[PDB]
């Protein structure tokens, strides 16, 4: 009958519209059912399309990553090299997510805070263990090659490995480096 | 619309990387020099803020208040 | 006796009910009965009776860091200054739970003290530049 | 449809000769002549010492009392 | 009801010629030794004020302000 | 009551006459150490004058607030 | 419980004899350190109270304020209904 | 949760131990470096406050207010009729 | 500008009015192709213990817009933020005099 026929339309269109599920072009997501990540024989599915477009429209919901090349920036910061002579160094990092469910597991909400802590604190320590050794001459006049490369390799590379946590760095450069007032005074 | 921290709003203010925002009760439309915009929330009532702002030289206009709406009341008090 | 016999069923059927439960995204937790140490759980489909047991969530999975400070003394009669953090993670909820009451200030205390130890040793310039390692 | 810190910079070199406030509006009034509206954002404690400073003259108004047949009108008019 | 401006009476007090004021909520009324009787109205709350006052002795008084006892107003309640 | 000059009740008490000040809201309750009585009203807000009360030792005291009694809430139920 | 004056409480904490205190709008409950309970009443808005008691290490503590329950209040609105 | 002493909050804050922070009126939830939270109120308004959680580096967050709807307005003044 | 539907890319479009009967279908046309411009400046070492000041200005183009998109988010950010550090590469082996001299070539 024309009621039955319309209730039945709506209930359907209803679990259409609740069930659907839109990922668009390169926001990768997560499953997750009530806490069930429906971690499988291999590692947890992965979400790209609306493949699978329906999804249980009561009981469960996902969360959407974004994946591209995130930026890090921070201000100014002190350091000293063997000469007792200090500088002021400035710098930023490239990121990128390795792999997904390590990632969500670990930083908690995946949130971008607690991630940019992290490398915050990892970076400043081993940055400042390395220029902490050469010269002052030498920071200034061939820093790329020697340090930045081997800040990078050796800040991604088992756990205390930065990328335990799930976390892809690209590349790491210095911006300025000025000196303080009254040696500027001086020179 | 999106979300930001007040405290990231003071680290744009003190490098100087707006120039313009609205202000109404206590929730503030931030426009940044690029011409990206969003909004951000005053936790307290804070008497350095407007100083924070002039002595930067950074340009802020505020706008006119929203009288509140009458008939919706009388209506529903009428049927 | 058949409105006794509903309401029974009725109220045992709301007492199963309210016994389901959640766990949120992969943080163990230990459920015990009475206060009888029964068993831990993963996230997910678990069923918790009513007045028998206890349910107690670890948030295992976090990175937890923690920091220190201190205007120290070193070795040649000099006075210095430093910073320190570190980062941890719990393994076993068992024995966090039930080893010290707040146990995060433990650590906390206890760093303070490894890092006079270590720092007592040595002097001022290798303190500054080389000796970092 | 001025201005804050203009309004501002304009105090600062003296050119608005005397001074119009309300609640948190302020009617501008210039040596020229020209008019304008300008809205407080928030409490300044810093408003009125700055012009007084410069020796502008400011004047207050009354209250806008709501008429008290008003009162009983709204009470009893629905 | 001569409107002598909150400004003007600022002045007028720096000249020292008031002699004493009764107060009440906005309204300023402050007279001088002629028996003047004139009126300003407060323009936002003022700090110095009354420390000011202070300097120049002057009388100043104010009064509880009048509320409508439970009589008009619940009357009109029950009208 | 005489209701006298705040001025006069901050000279005396730049004087030291006073033994004890009543605060209710505005209203004031005063009792003077040769046992003489008199009222006051405090014009608006004052940043100092709790702090010049207890620095040369009067004695201060304040009463709990005006609790509206229930049977108005009986009478706004059924009116 | 005995009410005390402002002044008198104020005096006595730079004697260094107080410990806990609940505030609430203008109560404040007081406990000594020799554990006996009282209550007092802030006369006006004093700018600097707050600091003056945690300056000294007393206990301070805030504590919520007591809105009406939903229930009651729509019935009381509907006590009338 | 369980409830804290002001004074311990800001034995805690300076001490390097606060995250987040929401204000809301004056309630506060508070999340610890340690992945611990709970929960803390403010007695009395306090000026300095703000700048002391700012200077020490503390990521502080705020809440938008609730807007009361109309339908409620609706219903409560409809609700006999 | 670029189309996407279920989530996924769609042809780019050459401007028309590319009849269509849908909405559902998103199109970003925010992207430009002329010319747009950056420039920085910075109180940057030299080589033995001086200081100088040097300027410059760049100008570039898009290609690709896929690529433009996504990819590192925020383009003038990237742009700018890394010729700092590329200026800086140029300016420090060279000495006062000779970035007096031949700034130019």
């Known amino acids: ?187 | 619309g999106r979300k930001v921290d007040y405290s990231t709003f003071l680290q744009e203010v003190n490098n100087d990387q707006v120039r313009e925002a609205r202000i109404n009760g206590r929730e503030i439309n931030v426009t940044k020099k690029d011409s990206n915009r969003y909004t951000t929330y005053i936790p307290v009532q804070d008497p350095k803020l407007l100083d924070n702002l002039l002595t930067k030289n950074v340009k802020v206009v505020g706008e006119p208040p929203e009288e509140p709406s009458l008939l919706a009341s009388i209506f529903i008090s009428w049927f | 006796g058949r409105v006794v016999t509903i309401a029974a069923a009725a109220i045992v059927i709301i007492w199963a009910a309210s016994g389901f439960y959640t766990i949120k995204e992969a943080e163990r937790g230990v459920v015990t009965r009475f206060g009888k140490f029964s068993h831990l759980v993963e996230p997910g489909l678990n069923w918790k009776p009513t007045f028998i047991d206890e349910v107690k969530p670890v948030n295992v999975e976090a990175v937890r860091e923690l920091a220190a400070s201190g205007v120290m003394l070193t070795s040649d009669e000099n006075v210095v200054r430093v910073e320190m953090n570190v980062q941890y993670r719990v393994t076993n909820p068992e024995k966090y739970l039930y080893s010290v009451t707040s146990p995060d200030d433990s650590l906390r205390q206890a760093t303070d003290s490894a890092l006079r130890g270590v720092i007592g040793k040595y002097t001022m310039d290798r303190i500054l530049t080389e000796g970092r390692t």
């Not at chain 1, 839109?22 to 590692?43: A, M, S």
């Not at chain 1, 490398?119 to 920071?139: H, M, Q, T, Y």
């Open chain 1, 1 to 187: 009958m024309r009621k039955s026929v319309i209730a039945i339309i709506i209930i359907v269109l209803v679990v259409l519209y609740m069930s659907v599920f839109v990922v668009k072009e390169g926001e990768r997501g997560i499953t997750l059912r009530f806490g069930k990540v429906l971690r499988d024989d291999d590692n947890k599915p992965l979400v790209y399309e609306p493949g699978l477009h329906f999804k249980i429209p009561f009981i469960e919901t996902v969360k959407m990553l974004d994946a591209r090349i995130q930026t890090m920036d921070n201000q100014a910061d002190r350091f000293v090299t063997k000469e007792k002579k200090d500088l002021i160094v400035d710098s930023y990092i490239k990121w990128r997510i390795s792999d997904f469910s390590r990632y969500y597991l670990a930083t908690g909400g995946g949130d971008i805070s607690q991630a940019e802590v992290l490398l915050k604190r990892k970076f400043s320590d081993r940055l400042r263990s390395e220029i902490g050794r050469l010269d002052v001459k030498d920071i200034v006049t061939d820093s790329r090659g020697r340090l930045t490369l081997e800040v990078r390799d050796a800040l991604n590379s088992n756990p205390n490995s930065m990328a335990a946590l799930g976390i892809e760095v690209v590349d790491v450069r210095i911006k300025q480096i000025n000196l303080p007032t009254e040696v500027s005074e001086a020179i």
